[PDB]
């Protein structure tokens, strides 16, 4: 063991060597000592190689104690990309919104958060899109349809107008649907919507 640790003290060059040595102590099941090695590696190689260490170090240390605060802190230190998402996915099921804030802290990432928020219940998801707006309009457009359909209800309908106006013939069918939905009141706005989509047909045809 000490004969091996002499390597840890000196002649460092590549990580492979590091993971190998930690695997030695793991084979001897020193466990916590092994985690220390990953502490000593990462102080060296910075946000590049350190990730190559860190992904296995996380998967393993979470596998060990399974104590929350220590590993939680370890990801906290760690955080300074997908690794954050795996890790966060772990923490939520072993505060949730806090994690969603972390993922929030790209379209696919936006899609995920929204999914986990839906898992915490429906109400947040409509809320999520507003964050979402700031190809994204397609995701945004989908949210508006989902959101436009959903509705507070007056703010939601006016939001449907704000979204339909936010930015394509199917979308024209969407705005026309929003106009048609009114009990003889969504006509003017509907014809205005088809007019705007026609204007989009004009700007599209104008393109070379």
């Amino acid at each position: 063991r000490k004969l091996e640790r002499a390597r840890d003290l000196f002649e460092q060059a590549l990580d492979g060597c590091p993971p190998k040595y930690a695997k030695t102590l793991y084979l001897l099941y020193a466990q916590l000592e092994e985690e220390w090695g990953l502490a000593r590696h990462a102080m060296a190689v910075y946000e590049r190689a350190t990730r190559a260490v860190e992904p296995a170090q996380q998967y393993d240390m979470f596998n060990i104690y399974i104590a929350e605060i220590y590993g939680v802190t370890h990801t906290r230190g760690i955080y300074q990309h997908a690794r954050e998402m795996c890790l966060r996915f772990a923490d939520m099921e072993c505060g949730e919104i806090d994690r969603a804030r972390a993922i929030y802290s790209t379209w696919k990432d936006f899609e995920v958060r929204h999914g986990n928020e839906d898992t915490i219940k429906e109400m947040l998801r409509i809320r999520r899109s507003v964050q979402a707006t700031y190809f994204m309009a397609s995701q945004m457009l989908k949210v508006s349809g989902s959101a436009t359909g959903t509705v507070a209800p007056g703010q939601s309908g006016m939001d449907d107008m704000k979204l339909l106006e936010q930015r394509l013939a199917a979308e024209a069918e969407r705005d026309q649907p929003l106009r048609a939905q009114s009990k003889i009141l969504f006509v003017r706005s509907d014809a205005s919507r088809e007019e705007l989509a026609e204007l989009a047909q004009q700007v599209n045809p104008e393109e070379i």
Binding site: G37, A39, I69
Partner: protein, 322 residues
């Protein structure tokens, strides 16, 4: 870098006794570095850097500082245990919003208290029906979890919507381990709600009879439950309940005649249908009830052909009626 252990701790402790008074972000960074030096049992500064940063999070407003009180208290809990609970109690109570801390603290407060039993329960519980609920399932349950572990929260929860239902199930479980606790639920059901306690007591003959009498005395869904129960037990009283309830309700009276008078269904049925049509183009239930009466008749081919004759007879009579 000089492989010093004790001298580094001397430097670190000699530094962080005066230098944090400005404030302690570099203190937390050097704490993480000392946790790094200890890595390359020794996670003491892991707690000290987290707890200092938790308190370091500024309290602005009332709910923001009370939200932080939930964070650092959980951090203190997992890792003066009474004084941290007392400072947490003043932070939640000292809230500007003064509406959401009642639901936030109660949780935290209860947890702290739990972490002796008689004094903690009296503080949390601190009205006529609540004392009646306590005397039925306080000493009787004799249990760490449920009688005393829902003897306070349950009372607190109501003021739940399902309190008269949960209290009736609590007495039925406590009495059996019974007609004394079930009658207390049946008496509190009358004070729609009584039909729930009536259908439950009968499921455990006499209960069924009680379920009928009660319904009768009281007075579309409520009578459908009492009619289906008296019909399933083993067709006279099923028709009597239909006459004093159905007058969805028209469709229910047709479904009642199919089951009760299955083994003068065509005559009476058709008469009723026509009457309904006259008492308000709307003859889609006369051709549909006649087509089901023909198909339901015992005979396949002969049974299906008879259903076509019965269905077409209603359609021909319906199409020739203005």
């Amino acid at each position: 870098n000089q492989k010093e252990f004790e001298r580094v701790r001397v430097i670190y402790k000699y530094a962080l006794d005066r230098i944090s008074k400005q404030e302690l972000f570099k203190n937390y960074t050097i704490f993480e570095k000392k946790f790094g030096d200890r890595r390359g049992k020794r996670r003491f500064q892991y707690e000290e850097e987290v707890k200092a940063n938790p308190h370091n999070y500024d309290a602005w407003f009332d709910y923001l500082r009370l939200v932080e009180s939930d964070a650092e208290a959980e951090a203190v809990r997992e890792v003066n245990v009474p004084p941290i609970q007392e400072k947490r109690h003043w932070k939640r109570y000292i809230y500007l919003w003064i509406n959401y801390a009642l639901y936030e603290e109660l949780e935290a407060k209860d947890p702290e208290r739990t972490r002796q039993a008689s004094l903690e329960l009296i503080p949390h519980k601190k009205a006529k029906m609540w004392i009646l609920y306590a005397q039925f399932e306080i000493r009787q349950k004799n249990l760490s979890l449920a009688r005393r572990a829902l003897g306070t929260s349950i009372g607190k929860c109501p003021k739940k919507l399902f309190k008269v239902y949960i209290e009736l199930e609590l007495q039925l479980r406590e009495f059996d381990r019974k007609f004394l606790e079930f009658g207390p639920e049946n008496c509190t059901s009358w004070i729609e709600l009584e039909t729930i306690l009536g259908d439950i007591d009968r499921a455990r003959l006499a209960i069924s009879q009680p379920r009928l009498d009660m319904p009768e005395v009281l007075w579309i869904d409520f009578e459908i439950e009492q009619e289906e129960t008296e019909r399933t037990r083993n067709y006279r009283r099923l028709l009597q309940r239909t006459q004093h309830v159905k007058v969805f309700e028209l469709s229910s009276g047709k479904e009642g005649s199919l089951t009760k008078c299955r083994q003068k269904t065509m005559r009476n049925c058709e008469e009723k249908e026509e009457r309904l049509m006259l008492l308000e183009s709307f003859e889609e239930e006369f051709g549909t009830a006649s087509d089901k009466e023909r198909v339901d008749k015992l005979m396949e081919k002969v049974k299906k052909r008879r259903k076509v004759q019965t269905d077409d007879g209603s359609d021909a009579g319906w199409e020739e009626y203005f």
